[PDB]
């Protein structure tokens, strides 16, 4: 299936665009402790239907603006 | 057993009204190359008397260790004061990769392939203490089997 990422929406001020934060756990090369890193992605939300704090998923497409190449596929769960 | 190796000779001095009084300290080890070994130290006015006293001390309190044919049983680490010592068994072609006092103790003790190293202070007396602590406490199999049969533990 299509490779998909999951994250939390941290900004929706832009029109038809959201910002999604994605966590990851990376092992230290030398000290061997898993440390927590984050990534920020700009995602194309055509219907402007995503509020802040939601848990959503996104997939890679062709660029639609500069530094914007991911489009969301569904809302896994909505922040209350 | 009788295989004598002299580890250290040192000159020490006390003070009295009038000046200094000098003495000599000798540290030696004695064994047979078949497992038994001991160490001794001696003070005297001149070197030969100190060496003889050290040899006589070493002949007393000579202990027995269990070894797997010129080599140790398992890698081990031991310490005395601020001296630390690490040893591990080696294959047949290896010599005795050890320094100073450790080499003497192991040559006399009958091992031949030991690949040893030491950390911290390298005072010969404390290093020999640490090496005897390490060798004395080796267990050998069918003795760690003090619980059950052999080859079910291994």
């Amino acid at each position: 299936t299509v490779r998909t990422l999951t994250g939390r929406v941290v900004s929706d001020k832009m029109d038809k665009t959201v910002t999604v934060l994605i966590e990851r756990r990376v092992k230290h090369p030398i000290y061997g402790k898993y440390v927590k890193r984050s990534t920020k992605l700009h995602a194309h939300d055509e219907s402007n239907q995503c509020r802040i704090g939601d848990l959503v998923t996104i997939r890679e497409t062709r660029p639609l603006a500069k530094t914007k190449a991911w489009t969301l596929v569904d809302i896994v769960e909505r922040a209350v | 057993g009788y295989i004598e190796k002299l580890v250290q000779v040192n000159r020490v001095a006390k003070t009295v009204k009038g000046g200094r009084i000098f003495a000599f300290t000798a540290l030696t080890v004695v064994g047979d190359g078949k497992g038994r070994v001991g160490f001794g130290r001696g003070k005297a006015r001149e070197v030969p008397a100190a060496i003889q006293k050290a040899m006589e001390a070493a002949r007393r309190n000579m202990i027995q260790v269990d070894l797997n044919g010129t080599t140790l049983q398992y890698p081990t680490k031991s310490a005395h004061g601020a001296s630390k010592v690490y040893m591990q068994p080696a294959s047949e072609g290896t010599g005795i990769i050890a320094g100073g006092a450790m080499r003497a103790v192991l040559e006399v003790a009958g091992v031949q392939n030991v690949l040893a190293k030491c950390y911290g202070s390298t005072n010969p007396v404390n290093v020999v203490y640490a090496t005897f602590k390490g060798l004395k406490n080796m267990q050998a199999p069918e003795a760690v089997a003090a619980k059950r049969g052999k080859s079910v533990e291994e």
Partner: protein, 122 residues
Amino acid sequence: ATINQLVRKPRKRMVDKSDVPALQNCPQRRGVCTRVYTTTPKKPNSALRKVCRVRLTNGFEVSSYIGGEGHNLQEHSVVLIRGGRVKDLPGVRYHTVRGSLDTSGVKDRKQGRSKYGAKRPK
């Protein structure tokens, strides 16, 4: 140090500084003598050591030692200097290579006459 303390900032090596700042990574350098003279050593030893002030092509002005019993250096002599610290003298951090450009080596030298640039007796 706890693992978290090392993760936040790891252990660092402080790079050691060279004891021959002149002659940057060069085994030896060419210079010209500006003043040859004699100086006295520190307290335990006692002699009259022969040294020369040298201006180098790097532009540094340093002080070098002149080894061997005799020498023919003068002011405006062009010399080759290598590294090497002289314990007895304060500030002398270099040596003058004998028999290289204008130092001519030592004479009546029979034992180890390669450190002092002496030809074989032949």
